[PDB]
């Protein structure tokens, strides 16, 4: 079983160095989404004093030609800091700084979907849309086989692994515990974790976050997971179908509510939103993964408690439908609904933008509107 | 010899992460019994503030179809918190929360035996029934062979291993020490441990616990053991006969006393109750393990210190029976008796409920009475 | 994956020694069935000259206190040569000698079923009963896990392995080829082989053999398999269900025909035989396994194209029925039928004796008749 | 790097057994195509005498439910011998027997394409159509990584490997040499081999074969390769794109000529055939791999000297076009043309049927004609 | 499990050298008993021509100080050739030459018991005493643990191993087969072999040999075993009780007959001989093991089928008796007593000399008589 070379370095030496008093200088690790829309990149600079707010952080630049985002002639791209978190890897006073990407002409990069999401959120800020997203992921070895699985083989049939405890049920819990503690320290609004049906597959839930903060929070959570995995020598994969066949896929279920939905008799608004989703289902399917269906397909086949990608279905407490209204929300007549369609590898900005455009702005047609 | 993949991860890194200050958020691990009656499941959520009592803990839900407990159409099940303990794995203020399972219609699940046991305990609360259970278990490697045995072979004959000390006598004492300390920290009323006759078999004793707390305590102790074993990469098995042949089986001896028995005089009450159980041997043998009786059979062969599968016997000082009256209890004419019949994999709620129904409610017949 | 220590000895040295001219002395390996009914034992003596026929071979004796057959006082048991074959392991002129076991008083041992089977065959020799048996077996490693399976894991789902070719489809074909060639050299009337559905499970077919020779051939075939496996360091298991669950079991399907059945319009006799089997189904099931019904029950479940142990079910070209009439036999109105009920670990002597007693002697009742 | 368990068995023991004189009995290995259209299955029976021609071989049956070819109620399938070859694995007098598959009613199975191909060939037998097919394949380890590649890595860039010699250039030449010698011994008209551009990828060429023999020959050649690979413990894959990205795909280039094409001024016939292909390109792309174009789409991208799956192109000595006329054929104005479109995993019967139907029978439309 | 370094040398190279034509020179391996009475020593010289009889072989000398047989000042000892056998290790025309050891003054060495045995045999040559000896031995690894046993552990309980077949039953059969074939080639009168009760323990039987030749044969057989073991890298031990506990030890049962016993009504002579043996006990148990009781007194515990070292107990069958008289003898009034008392490590010359002195010469007292 092959773990990364980096994981076999003596970590006690690393701990010896990390315990040195750092002094007055502060490390800022800038994180940004690359040109593929799935990968995260990061690099660190030293600042002289502790920044009080995100507006005090300097803009930076990077080579876009190395990240699949620009041509060689004008390869400089700009990093604009947008969110600041405590750094769980380097401890206080160091910070994680999530940034937006701009082109050489100061136009949004092709994958900078936060900019448009921010516009939509400013337009609908008065209704306070809340999102919760459940990010499923699979721990893999560096050889591409799932972590903890028998070499060149499969574990026992599905059943004992969901929320399992024991050496034969849960593979890689150390990673989940480390990620959970790191997220809590950093200030991400992580609300829980559970083992998924497939061994070595896990799910963490972020939320409820208001508006643009979801993307800020979710992306950084993914980064922290990768970093934790890097320390341990495993790979977190967000592929919607890591193992073909009867093994469960990975989704990113999105719970959505508005002020009207959360207040008394808000179920009516829930039904209106779901009805609108019924009218743009194909647009949303195109919106819920970076490759436009070419990924979401493998998973959603119409089994293993997933919806069929082609047919929209709705029901109360129906875990196999495209949209599920939780039973408690139905009983209390207020709350949220759960869109079960997004793939695990989705860009959260695209998902939230599509949901708000369809449900709240009453948009129609295949292309999003451009607003003044 | 195969330890789990998770056990080979660098635990110093995990310790590095666990030392981060967690802040104000609190992790709650919900634990519940699954559809098999032997396995435990768990998942964790984050709460914003410190709960003061068990009544403050929120209800939760899970997918019952993945735990052999529901059909696909109405797969949601409910977790009602019933017991709260300190979390020994994550330290204060985090908690382990043991829960009852309810169906979609708010009826007790098939394996939610705590509900009826709690009812019976409320019915007999004035007599203060005390129970003690001696849980035997075997440490196994992930390859299915007992931990520490020679590969594809057998250690020396039984004899030197019971309560043994030395590299050749006790296999896996680190696990017992870790489990013991974790149980003490969590607040389980663990009263002792000893190495059993077969190498790698250990026994811990819980009690004396009053009424319903035994099931609450015993189940959570089992969970902690699995979790400790998970950290170490071994598997705790409660199978009543893990290795066929001359190797000792695993039982769950149940010490039983009432308030009347503990007071001056009462040995008589022991003998009468003994008689009662005698008449309803089959019944108890049915209540005392999951799989009908088949499981216990492989253990209660009669040769290696056990009672034949079909025979009630009682005496003072005799390890060749089903119920033992301790010598000191006989001499002082007060105390408890030891039912030696329950299998190691028994559900404690079933055992305690059957014992109370027979000894305290003077029930007769094959089916338990329904009370108003 | 652990192969036997013996298999790691340098086989080139063995080959160096085996090529020395042996001279005039001849090695005879005496083979006999032990007290369990499944194990085979053997030992070798040197004779001075080449025996021309089986009657020239001397009777031998052995100690019966170890091979679980006898007990105290009288132990010596007698081996009477009954079948002689060429030695495929040592080549001509050496021989394998299969023997009957007799007690000190020259009465047949409890497991010496050849004596009675031979009696019945002598009684029915004029009708020339022919049998063919398809012996399925599983190749296992010395650690008790099936050979070629991933360590502590399972291969892919059933489907690609039956009669498979390729490194990922057929595990252990070398064993099958060696066994097959050895059987042809020895003179066993082996008629074919194929890979079965579960990986590492294979089936060889012996027959059509007339009367007692069938048993003689089949037992010796099993010995050769063990010996071949011994050379290679793997273990052949005849357990009817080596791996629990959805993995295929191992059976010993028995094709039966008589002279009358093989002639024109012989189908009527086949149907008569089937009716008699239908009248003695329980006797035959009891006669088809060692432990005593506790083996065949694990295989004959009604799934995976097996009959249910309790119900006698015919069916032309019906591969799931208790009795199948092959299609060609049905179309031509003559031939054999296939009894699918015997377990892989059956004693062939018991199956053929019971079948002949029911179908040809028109016997009834639970106990065998005593003939003059 | 993980080779199969079977390959680590001591092959000297196997050689010891194979050198035993086999005697008069003969082994016949029946080979057939399974329900997937790519896999081959085989099983062996013993015959009493040496068959002189293929018509003397008996029909056989097998269980179709295990090969994805029938339902449970009528699971018997029939093997009709159609081609006989010498067995290179067991030597004379043993034989390999390639068979057609029939249903219980003697109708051709869904994947039994030989029946129709034979019909078409009989209809056009007077023109003596000759085909040559170039079967490319990749040697893989049992871990799913190409054989000889660095663990979890890639060899050097493409360039040095095509027809390479040396330990660092050609991976697995022993397999190619063994396969070549086995094919020559069996009597297959194998005409050459070369190392392909990707390391561990090889190509062998079969032909020129007349009509139906192409499929008979090619399938058996594939079987021999799998068997050779089985001995060595590697897996031969015919996947058209075994490794995504810039690594070369595997094709099955088909050289086609008729008697008219081979005669003086036959270039005109070549151009006419190419013109017809231009009119039925889409039908042929659908016909040239077993999944209707899905497999071939991964290979025919327009890069790496492959044609684009959507556009037909033709040229003299143009290796990237859909159809290439070799330069020497163009200069001499007679010969064959090379269809470069078929995927490596194609069924040769489908390719030859489509080519003959389009080029020689002047068929048009999407569905094949039914002839009297 | 640790085999010797010598066994890991490439034996193919050795085989390459051994096939070279040896020419006219001949290798003679001189073998002699060392000062311990258990070890064998050997060295080889080249002779110019093929000796026709044993009288043509030259006397040799060696350094006795290295073999615990002489002092430093006069350390030269003499080897007198006494028996010549074909060399199975070097093939014809090479020979093994067993020798007597003489001191510098031409007096027999302390361990040269052959001289006196030859004298006694010459004295009783007219009665033709025949002996057969059954030599049990245990195969050990070079680490001192029994060969094939699990590392630092024990195999399963005794029972399945006696005369066992299979990878899990018989450890080291290659060695037994090689030794057997080598003995046959060399001309030793080996009469059979069988696996013993303890795994890795085997027994071979030599005889019937007349008089002194028995010792010649047995010693040389032991040498061949050591040499065979040397090739395989294991150690043959004759230590009376190989591994302490419930593991069977090793004996050398001696079958004895005279010409008178073998003729009609010879049973009377058998009874007379047994009566004489009854009149000499401790003498025999001090001449049936290199160092008196000590070693032997670890086997004859009388528990695991042995004769409690204390008293004799003639008995038909009675396997656990001192001098067994096989049933055959009893019901045939002729046969051979089986002195079941000598240990496996006995000097055969001492056993046969003592038996002849007691049974045939009617000697009495503790010390042997000196004859003219």
Swiss-Prot record, chains A, B, C, D, E:
State the species of origin: Rattus norvegicus (Rat)
Does this entry carry the keyword RNA-binding? no
Keywords for this entry?
A: Acetylation, Angiogenesis, ATP-binding, Cell membrane, Cytoplasm, Endoplasmic reticulum, Ligase, Lipoprotein, Magnesium, Manganese, Membrane, Metal-binding, Microsome, Mitochondrion, Nucleotide-binding, Palmitate, Phosphoprotein, Transferase, Ubl conjugation
Annotated membrane topology is: Lipid-anchor
Subunit organization: Decamer; composed of two pentamers. Interacts with PALMD. Interacts with RHOJ. Interacts with BEST2; this interaction tethers a fraction of GLUL to the membrane, causing a decrease of cytosolic glutamine synthase (GS) activity and inhibits the chloride channel activity of BEST2 by affecting the gating at the aperture in the absence of intracellular glutamate.
Q: Tell me the protein's name.
A: Glutamine synthetase
Entry GO terms, CC: axon terminus; cell body; cell projection; cytoplasm; cytosol; endoplasmic reticulum; glial cell projection; mitochondrion
**Where are the N6-acetyllysine residues found in this chain?**
11, 14
Q: What is its EC number?
A: 6.3.1.2, 2.3.1.225
Q: What range(s) does the GS beta-grasp domain occupy?
A: 24-106
Q: Where does ADP bind?
A: 336-338
């Amino acid at each position: 079983m092959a773990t990364s070379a980096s994981s076999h370095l003596n970590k006690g030496i690393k701990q010896m160095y990390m315990n040195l008093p750092q002094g007055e200088k502060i490390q800022l690790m800038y994180i940004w989404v690359d040109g593929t829309g799935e990968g995260l990149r990061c690099k660190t600079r030293t600042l002289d004093c502790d920044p009080k707010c995100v507006e005090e952080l300097p803009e930076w630049n990077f080579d876009g030609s190395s990240t699949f985002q620009s041509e060689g002639s004008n390869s400089d791209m700009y990093l604009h800091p947008v969110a600041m978190f405590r750094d769980p890897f380097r401890r206080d006073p160091n910070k994680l700084v999530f940034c937006e990407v701009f082109k050489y002409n100061r136009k949004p990069a092709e994958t900078n979907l936060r900019h448009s999401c921010k516009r939509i959120m400013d337009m609908v800020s008065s209704q306070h849309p809340w999102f919760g997203m459940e990010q499923e992921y699979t721990l893999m070895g560096t050889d591409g086989h799932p972590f903890g699985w028998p070499s060149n083989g499969f574990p026992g049939p599905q059943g004992p692994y969901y929320c399992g405890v024991g050496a034969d049920k849960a593979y890689g819990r150390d990673i989940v515990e480390a990620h959970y503690r790191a997220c809590l320290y950093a200030g991400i609004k992580i609300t829980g974790t559970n083992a998924e049906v497939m061994p070595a597959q896990w799910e963490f839930q972020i939320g409820p976050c208001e508006g643009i903060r979801m993307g800020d929070h979710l992306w950084v959570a993914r980064f922290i997971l990768h970093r934790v995995c890097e320390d341990f020598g495993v790979i977190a994969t967000f592929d919607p179908k890591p193992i073909p066949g009867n093994w469960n896929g990975a989704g990113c279920h999105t719970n959505f509510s508005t002020k009207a939905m959360r207040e008394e008799n808000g179920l009516r608004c829930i039904e209106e939103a779901i009805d609108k989703l019924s009218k743009r289902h194909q647009y949303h399917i195109r919106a819920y993964d970076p490759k436009g269906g070419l990924d979401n397909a493998r998973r959603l086949t119409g089994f293993h408690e997933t919806s069929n990608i082609n047919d929209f279905s709705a029901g109360v407490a129906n875990r196999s439908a495209s949209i599920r209204i939780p039973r408690i929300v139905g009983q209390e007549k207020k709350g949220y609904f759960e869109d079960r369609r997004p793939s695990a590898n989705c860009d959260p900005y695209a998902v939230t933008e599509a949901i708000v455009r369809t449900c709240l702005l009453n948009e129609t047609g295949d292309e999003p509107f451009q607003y003044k």
